[PDB]
Amino acid sequence: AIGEFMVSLPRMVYPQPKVLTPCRKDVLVVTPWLAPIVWEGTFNIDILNEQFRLQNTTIGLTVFAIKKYVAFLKLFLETAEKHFMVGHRVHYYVFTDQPAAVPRVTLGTGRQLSVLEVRAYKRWQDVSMRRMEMISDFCERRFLSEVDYLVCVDVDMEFRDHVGVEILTPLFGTLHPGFYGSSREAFTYERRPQSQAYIPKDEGDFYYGGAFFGGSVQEVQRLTRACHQAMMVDQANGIEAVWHDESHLNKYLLRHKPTKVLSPEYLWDQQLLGWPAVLRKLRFTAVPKNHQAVRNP
Amino acid sequence: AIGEFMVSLPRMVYPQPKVLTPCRKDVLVVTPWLAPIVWEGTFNIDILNEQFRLQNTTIGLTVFAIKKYVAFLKLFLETAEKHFMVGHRVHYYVFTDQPAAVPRVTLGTGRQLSVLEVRAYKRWQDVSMRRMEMISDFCERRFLSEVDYLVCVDVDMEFRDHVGVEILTPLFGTLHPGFYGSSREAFTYERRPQSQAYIPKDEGDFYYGGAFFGGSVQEVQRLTRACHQAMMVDQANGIEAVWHDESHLNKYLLRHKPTKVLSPEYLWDQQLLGWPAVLRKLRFTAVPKNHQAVRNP
């Protein structure tokens, strides 16, 4: 549940925090609005696991596998079983136009998977964008009654290392791996004022990735509905934002600041970007794909 | 109010966060449980002021002025008017055995003061300790219906610099200025197992000061009631914790981790400790006093 039951941590033995030693010297670990930026070295997972297990936390994970992207499910789910929220209650929600294509992946105790059938749009842009509507449609259907937090990710990915309760918070976004070191004017925000996703050149905190966001069910409902409604205004006006759902996500998180930000450890592409010294772990990574082949019949 | 009304920030122009530049190189700015540690340089007050003003936030400030400590009220309140939550709604709650001794301090718009008459205990230790019971007694009386957050401080103090909405969170404690650089075994926790405040030598995150804590009304109610109930168990067992309410506060915050920690900028004694380089601002500081004289007839 969320809202903090009154509970007490047990005695624990762990290293004392070091007030006069920074946990990272190379990166920003807190935003200007006092949201943690989650990097390895910022958290003691044992403390966090205790806190969230005592609250009996259930995490939902949404993933869309539409048309040829069903091919990504087996590795996605296998690796989620190794690395995502292990020890906590997990409910996977696989949205697909092909239920019979969902692989039979063996789940650990306390973990379940539901298949949600949805329609397939022709254009990959529309498939990607309509995730906001579909996630918002399923808050009342399932999520409010089944999970405490939702984590909403791309399927063309694999887990390689721990992704756990350190991410959980009312609202989070993830630093896009292409832009974490970039100046805001280089961010690929929507720059046309005729779109609802428009962000001027002198605004913006971060460039968040569309492939990994989440929060409490309430906050995810708000985000997804807002982004969908904004998309529909754009469609009525004959404009499609340059990066689709990601552009609208960025507008939303500029205006509604996240309560945690995940570092690019949580959203990476090793083929394109290697393994920089600033990433102590590569947690959730792109699986190589040929856009043209996989997005079209 | 608290619980986040759906609201949007206006357009704002401010410096871009620097992902690859730490906001402080000299101090820890986030705890191992991902609570911000509030130091100058960690926050953009303009963003935070927007967030909290859009939620129409009201902050209660409790202060006890019992027996001779009424002498501290005028400077406390005058300086709070200059530095505490300016621009936000504030409700001061002055607990005293002498209502006629509360000075007539001129308040800014949107700020009010209530005088709450309470009994005076003989021993200063009991006066200090019984604040927990009294704060807890006033959650149902006033606070739940009047304020969003409570800030609970010593009176023998003055504000010298900004203390604002950067502190606000469900539950906060403050690093005691005598111990922020100390190892845990040097912390003056209660070390006798026969007290409810007992903390073993291999446990503890920080040594929090009894003179400055707070949070949402709900969380402050929980803390104060727990500390009072623990005090009463100790009294029945013929033991008084070594540092009184501070010892019980430390036990509570070990077991129930705060969601922000304030640096010693927020609780300082310049006479005893000077102005170290690590303090960029001295915000809330001790007023010199002679313990023996001021605590006794």
Ligand SMILES: O=c1ccn([C@@H]2O[C@H](COP(=O)(O)OP(=O)(O)O)[C@@H](O)[C@H]2O)c(=O)[nH]1
């Ligand atoms: O034919 C498609 C196109 C997209 N997607 C979903 O939409 C997400 C976003 O698209 P994609 O991963 O192609 O975007 P990219 O990471 O390349 O920007 C995918 O991970 C899938 O979950 C899908 O299921 N089928």
Ligand SMILES: O=c1ccn([C@@H]2O[C@H](COP(=O)(O)OP(=O)(O)O)[C@@H](O)[C@H]2O)c(=O)[nH]1
């Ligand atoms: O006779 C007394 C003793 C204590 N206090 C209150 O209890 C707080 C804690 O006591 P004190 O400041 O003496 O503790 P110290 O800061 O010296 O540890 C004071 O700030 C007052 O708010 C009081 O009002 N009258």
Ligand SMILES: [Mn+2]
């Ligand atoms: Mn993708």
Ligand SMILES: [Mn+2]
């Ligand atoms: Mn004091």
